[model samples]
Target: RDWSSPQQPFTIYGNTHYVGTGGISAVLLSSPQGHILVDGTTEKGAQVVAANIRAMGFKLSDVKYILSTHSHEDHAGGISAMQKLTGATVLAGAANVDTLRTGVSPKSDPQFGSLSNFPGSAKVRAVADGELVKLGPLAVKAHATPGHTEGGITWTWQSCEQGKCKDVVFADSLTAVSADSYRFSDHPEVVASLRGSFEAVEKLSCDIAIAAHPEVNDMWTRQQRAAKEGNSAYVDNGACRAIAAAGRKRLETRLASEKR
Candidate 1:
């Protein structure tokens, strides 16, 4: 439904949504050392992801790791198949090991078999809070931000200064970083879940925050400007802080609402 592509009928913010049959997926990053795939959408979508990578002037074989934010079907659906296709190791929180090992989505089976084919499926590895995962020269640290799921994870990428050790770069830009929004009233469980996520946000220390969904704010525009003018100030700008405050307020509002 990429309405912006003129091939579809609906569009958002002048951007045509790329309609794929599988599910939502996003690449963590690609570097000279290796690349990381975050939340493989579906079995078929894994192939699309690989194809997209090839089209981007990189080989699919370069993907060394596939990280799952949680064991939810939508997030880890194609992971096992992806591992088989790329020989990439799957990293997820320890709580998801049984699910990851068994490859079972839950009581209900998913359309994609990758997640349900676990035992002999793929090389599944466990990640814990504060644990570091090494890929070539890249060091990825796992943060146990268990709110969305009982053992959800948030991974951080560390950067260097002049090729020297600098600081950790958290991939979450907090674009949609508000606490509990008004809509969560329909799902009290989400508020309970996000309690842990908010605590994690409060304790997280990082040099940068990379947003997963860039639509919350004009993230790409600011990032583009920063890239052209060499501006690092954008990260510390007041907008992000304001967004952070909004996130906190949303959470607090939900907390008070629940008490009532």
Candidate 2:
């Protein structure tokens, strides 16, 4: 399916709900005080995201904040629209602030020309690495993972079921994709950034990993088995390490192709 394809929304854990499209990933962490949303799927998918949220029995106005993973269109395109509906503030990595403000990626992005621009959010703010975004009982930590995009971030938080809790990571995209003319060899800093991100993600206190690209961690498969496996199907401590390892492999392959 495409980035905007409709998908049935469901609870992934205690307060974490999968509210994105079939291709993209967006999550809603709910609380009585308020709720925090992660990512906005795509521009066209905004309606899908909105309906999904309400379908889950949450009010749009109750959403306090919307977090961004990157400024890419598929990930951030619907943020502006969703923000309008929810009237929530948008937050992103410092490097992605301008892009989120202007709805256009700068040359610093690896996929600058190859990417599509989305509607800039009305209220966008920059978040520092390791910063905590707090809303009532919700507190999500930002981990800078700048490889696929210079402003990429992987978010982490805890969710409880009954008396048990698990760490959840909404990992940003980590593949080394780029524009046709952009070369990673020329930008050593980018390579190092990617390397740093890989290590950072691998070392995370991750129990459930939901990647920006859901297929990265086989989210659909996990969802399919949730009927029988329940939420435990999504619990995998090794998931974060596996995601980082895949990122490393992709980066290595991309670098090798650059020489050929």
Candidate 3:
């Protein structure tokens, strides 16, 4: 099925990082409302990201907020262009705000003399843990999850259906995980950090998890089908857990090897 269509309101993007493309969410929609972009890609994908949203029948101006999971360029690159197009606000965790203020990516530590070079002009509003970010009928609670980076954050979206609001964790990040054999091999601290990130997300009550990478959780199947069949938003908790376990197992093995 064509992944780049307006048929689904909620879409996850894979950023073409060293990790993989769409490995992180480029955009998320408030289903039936508007888009709540997780991170915008570089200027290269800004038009593509924008076009996909527009094709979904949303006005360019309805893109309410652009939130950064952290300040990596893959996530923050197209932010400025999207803001210019829709006048949406940019937000992130406190540490991320500091990062944006400093104009630095977590691990790479780029030299962006002035923060003005980034999106929303690299200006991001701070989102605290447990705080609810509302867009129309959708309310997503944010969780601060560092370790991948100093200011990394994930979110839990709660929505009422059949008089019950389901809690879904959008844990879209990969860091400290030993899935990258070359980079993470023999790094003990990195292994610990990877476990910590998992434990951090476990603290939150999550019915289902949507990962930035499908390898972690194939939460896009519903959207995938809807792009063709017009079904409903769906999530597979089992798939999410399996993916997480796979990653964890890889990390554990590497950690054991390093111990020897």
Candidate 4:
């Protein structure tokens, strides 16, 4: 239930690598000055991510910043441990900064107050919508894509090979999981935010896109196909928009079910 196991890390594109476990999606953005880590899975996942980083011949000490898509335990649970390991600064959306610091889910979270808690809290540098975080030659823009969480944010950056550049997007989740007592119909703000998120995500520049969960974007299958046929098959300009459309449909379905 705690998505906290190790998996083989691999290179996805130039300067970007998958360092996450089998159940969670973590990515590494490498640069000569240092590196930035995105998501850390469960608390135990810290060790797994660190091991994978070392295995990929990168120094753990070189990690300079740690960021996340949301504050869910499965995603940000290991962040505190990762901070200790690399002494990296943690960056989160403005809405999730408090949750990260308290190591508690927000009251609005669908899974709030559950038994899925992790150890230690973290201090995060809260980022505004459309804020850009720069490290060395790497520059990642944080786009507020709140739906799954009030503070959910998707990251976008460009990776280059030779003279070719590909826009890479680490999309935040769009799953509309609500609390039993909470109804999407009753919460206009949340519904509006989710709808806005769909539009925001659809507008992102994504030549190659990945999600917080590997399965969300068929990462494994795409990896296999890439291995055989090269990565040209994974570069789809419509990928992010496709996911947004699906999420919008699901949100509509969820709202309709709530009405009935």
Candidate 5:
């Protein structure tokens, strides 16, 4: 799936709705009082996200906050447009605030040299690790899950329906992908940060996990099965652990390859 392909949106569970593109993942968590957005896909995907929200019967102005997973183009590319459309304040990790506002990755980024620039978003703010973002009945917590990007964050919140609630995690990308000339072995802190993120993600209270790259968690497959199984298809108590396992595996493999 390409990053900007159009995809019809659907409710994931309770007030959480999948409003991203065919390739990427963007979620809308709604409440009567206001709404929150997890991530925006590509630059063009903002149109799709806006369309999905309106189609779902939510007013764009009701979106109080747009939480970013990272400041990469593929994820943060549309935040700028979305903020304009929804008039929402953008929240991200301290390291990503500048990048998000300028639409530029710093030299410290693992993929700095390889990545492209995105649209600079307005009203971008830094959120501390373990900080809680509360709006009406929504209380989304940000967990620093830096690895793929130093500013990466994994968000967590509970969604309830018919008295049944589930802990949902919007996991940040954990894959240790870097640009040419960038070496994980050359940066001990980056590697350690990734390792720390692995530990943090593994210990998250996750009932349903959605990877920044949806395919990482087999989201499409689950969505297909959700037709019959309902949101139960999205539930797996071990989802967080599994995501962390894959991150560790990728990091180990990358470190091994760098040994050359």
Candidate 6:
């Protein structure tokens, strides 16, 4: 079972807690009004995630909004079960609406045929680029950055602790893994779209950067490194651009291979 057992949930920053499995990342953003959960891992993983949330002294019922980076099962498979558990509204990028509604992977997905479909469907409201979902003092803005999936959206918000505030970006996965049959050179529009996504991610104001998959941004390594440095805070203003650059290199490499 390639699944790493769930870890002890810990605060990543002010009002943001990491409540996820060892591999996938599900972030909890709390406010007096209600809490927001971003990315719920797999369906079975939802139970663990919920338990982590409650273990941290937050009510699972208080989770009012559930957001996702994309509709990939690993990142969104738990939505159906989570919605049942918390009755949270599922907010996702406009392009992912149908995928979330039907609980089916899009045909264009690189792993569509290989990946198991999530068990059930849930109501998902479409969010536009730059749209904000507010809960009490928390206002999370969605930034459309489609690359790994056509509906990929990175979320940004402000988190303050002890009189200090930092801009947080829950960046969507930018890896350009494609199906064998899919060719980037065949689709000029897709190439352009991914390039634009790279640019958008580079421009994000990210003091603390998180991703759907923790290892994608070397999150755990950075976490340990930061703690060793005596600054447990996850503050890396250049993290976004650094990862964005790596994503861009992979994208360009894929494009170049297609040209070859």
At residue 202, give the lDDT of candidate 5: 93
**Model 2, range 1-260, lDDT digits (tens) per residue?**
59999999999989999999999999999999999999999999999999999999999999989999999999999999999999999999888988988899999888888887889888888889999999998899999999777888899999998879999999998888888989998899989999999999999999999999999999999988888989899999999999999999998998898895
Q: State model 5's lDDT.
A: 0.92
RMSD of 4: 1.5
Give per-model TM-scores.
0.63, 0.98, 0.69, 0.96, 0.98, 0.94
Cα TM-score of candidate 2: 0.98
Task: Mark the 10 consecutive residues where model 1 has the least summed lDDT.
Answer: 7-16
Q: Which residue pairs does candidate 2 place in steric collision?
A: none
Q: What tens digits encode model 3's per-residue C-alpha lDDT throughout 1-260?
A: 12222222343321111111343345455455765766665555566677766655567687788777766555666677777887888888886776655545544222223223444344468888778888876676777766555567786665455565445666746444323233454444555556766666655665556665433555456556647754234444454355446657766675566663
Q: Give the residue spans of candidate 5 off by over 4 A.
A: none
> TM-score for model 1?
0.63
Model 1 residue runs over 4 Å out of place are: 1-25, 28-33, 42-44, 100-121, 160-193, 216-218, 223-247, 256-260
**Model 6 whole-model lDDT (C-alpha atoms):** 0.83
Which residue window of length 10 is worst by lDDT in model 3? 12-21
TM-score of 3: 0.69
Question: Regarding lDDT, does 4 or 5 come out ahead?
Answer: 5
* Model 6 stretches with alpha carbons more than 4 Å out: 1-4, 230-233
* Model 6 pairs whose backbones collide: none
Instruction: Provide the global lDDT of candidate 3 against the true structure.
Output: 0.57
The backbone clash count of each candidate, in order, is: 6, 0, 10, 0, 0, 0
Error of 3 at 252 (Å): 2.4
- Model 6 clash tally? 0
